[PDB]
Amino acid sequence: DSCIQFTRHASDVLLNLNRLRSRDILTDVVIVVSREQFRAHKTVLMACSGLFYSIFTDQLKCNLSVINLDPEINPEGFCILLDFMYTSRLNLREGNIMAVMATAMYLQMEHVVDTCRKFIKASE
Amino acid sequence: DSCIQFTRHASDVLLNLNRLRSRDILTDVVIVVSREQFRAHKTVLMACSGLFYSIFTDQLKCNLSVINLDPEINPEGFCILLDFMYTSRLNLREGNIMAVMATAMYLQMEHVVDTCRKFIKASE
Amino acid sequence: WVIP
Amino acid sequence: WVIP
Ligand SMILES: O=C1Cc2cc(Nc3nc(Cl)ncc3F)ccc2N1
Ligand SMILES: O=C1Cc2cc(Nc3nc(Cl)ncc3F)ccc2N1
Ligand SMILES: [Cl-]
Ligand SMILES: [Cl-]
């Protein structure tokens, strides 16, 4: 087409979606990761994760307001990935990289799994 | 912080939100612009428009599944802006610029109003 | 704004 | 991935 494009638009949209999350505005699901609860927007979760895409496109699960993750999932790993979904920034540290990579494999976040594998390879 | 950032994340999120819109997945509102109807996600509309942000943060209006816009609003202008919200690309043409600018002023989309004003100034 |  |  003959469109013009605003370079910062996608980043500005994501920043505003994170502001809505902060302020608990229009959050429509609670993700339970053992004893912890995380509120989020189903659409953002589906846009970032192959697992949430599969869950919320299912005719029965799309209607659930609470999703319980596998008990092996680490809440801190999930929290780091949820922050990544809403900001593009990944808080990857020597002390959390294994939990983050395991969580990203479970959530089907291929770009995160890729950077974790590279950082692990560099340490070996 | 000591975060790493995935450059293409925000663009990839927006592309997936537009794919959900295309496939009518988890759309939760219908915007009526005279005889036309547009399905969308309330969160994306709020993230892009000062008017939708004000509407869906209102304790009564946040619960509505149908929003009727002012009858003076042009459906094609709205359609062009809705596509911009979901893609960052604005289909601005000599034949639609006045309707697009009027719609962007009503929707409170300051960056769009800015580029329309500049394109109009260049023609004068 | 840019030409994409 | 970059250093932001
Ligand atoms: O690593 C990843 C990240 C990821 C996100 C999605 N999300 C969606 N995919 C499509 Cl095609 N349309 C809409 C979506 F919300 C699916 C698979 C995967 N795998
Ligand atoms: O030209 C514009 C575009 C625009 C979008 C928003 N959106 C939100 N603003 C904030 Cl601070 N937090 C969350 C949001 F969804 C408000 C005002 C305006 N004015
Ligand atoms: Cl990813
Ligand atoms: Cl704008």
Side-chain angles (χ1 to χ4, degrees), chain A residues 1-58 60-109 111-124, chain B residues 1-58 60-109 111-124, chain C, chain D:
Chain A
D1 219 301
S2 60
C3 293
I4 56 174
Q5 178 189 70
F6 189 64
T7 306
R8 298 183 324 274
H9 180 71
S11 295
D12 287 353
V13 168
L14 194 65
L15 177 61
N16 284 340
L17 292 175
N18 196 33
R19 287 167 170 166
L20 297 177
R21 182 177 64 120
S22 291
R23 297 170 198 155
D24 200 36
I25 296 166
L26 289 198
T27 52
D28 54 4
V29 73
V30 179
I31 308 305
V32 180
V33 189
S34 293
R35 284 191 189 268
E36 308 302 306
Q37 293 176 36
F38 299 90
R39 297 192 54 89
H41 299 96
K42 287 179 188 175
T43 56
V44 175
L45 298 182
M46 296 170 81
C48 297
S49 157
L51 187 71
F52 289 122
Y53 179 72
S54 293
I55 293 168
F56 302 123
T57 53
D58 175 78
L60 276 177
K61 300 185 187 74
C62 68
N63 291 143
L64 298 173
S65 60
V66 178
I67 300 293
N68 302 303
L69 302 191
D70 187 295
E72 289 254 65
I73 302 303
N74 175 260
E76 188 188 49
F78 185 78
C79 186
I80 287 159
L81 291 172
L82 186 61
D83 284 343
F84 169 72
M85 293 184 182
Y86 279 87
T87 65
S88 312
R89 291 177 192 192
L90 186 69
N91 183 27
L92 201 59
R93 298 174 63 89
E94 188 185 36
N96 69 29
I97 188 159
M98 298 314 289
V100 172
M101 188 175 73
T103 313
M105 289 173 68
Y106 171 75
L107 294 181
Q108 299 164 215
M109 295 174 71
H111 296 299
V112 174
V113 178
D114 185 61
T115 194
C116 287
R117 287 202 203 277
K118 281 168 169 70
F119 276 59
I120 291 157
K121 191 191 176 285
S123 288
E124 295 173 352
Chain B
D1 219 301
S2 60
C3 293
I4 56 174
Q5 178 189 70
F6 189 64
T7 306
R8 298 183 324 274
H9 180 71
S11 295
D12 287 353
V13 168
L14 194 65
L15 177 61
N16 284 340
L17 292 175
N18 196 33
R19 287 167 170 166
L20 297 177
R21 182 177 64 120
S22 291
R23 297 170 198 155
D24 200 36
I25 296 166
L26 289 198
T27 52
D28 54 4
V29 73
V30 179
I31 308 305
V32 180
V33 189
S34 293
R35 284 191 189 268
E36 308 302 306
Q37 293 176 36
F38 299 90
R39 297 192 54 89
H41 299 96
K42 287 179 188 175
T43 56
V44 175
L45 298 182
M46 296 170 81
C48 297
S49 157
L51 187 71
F52 289 122
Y53 179 72
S54 293
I55 293 168
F56 302 123
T57 53
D58 175 78
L60 276 177
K61 300 185 187 74
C62 68
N63 291 143
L64 298 173
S65 60
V66 178
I67 300 293
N68 302 303
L69 302 191
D70 187 295
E72 289 254 65
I73 302 303
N74 175 260
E76 188 188 49
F78 185 78
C79 186
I80 287 159
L81 291 172
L82 186 61
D83 284 343
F84 169 72
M85 293 184 182
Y86 279 87
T87 65
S88 312
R89 291 177 192 192
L90 186 69
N91 183 27
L92 201 59
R93 298 174 63 89
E94 188 185 36
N96 69 29
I97 188 159
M98 298 314 289
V100 172
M101 188 175 73
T103 313
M105 289 173 68
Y106 171 75
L107 294 181
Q108 299 164 215
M109 295 174 71
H111 296 299
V112 174
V113 178
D114 185 61
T115 194
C116 287
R117 287 202 203 277
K118 281 168 169 70
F119 276 59
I120 291 157
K121 191 191 176 285
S123 288
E124 295 173 352
Chain C
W1 292 85
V2 302
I3 302 301
Chain D
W1 292 85
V2 302
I3 302 301

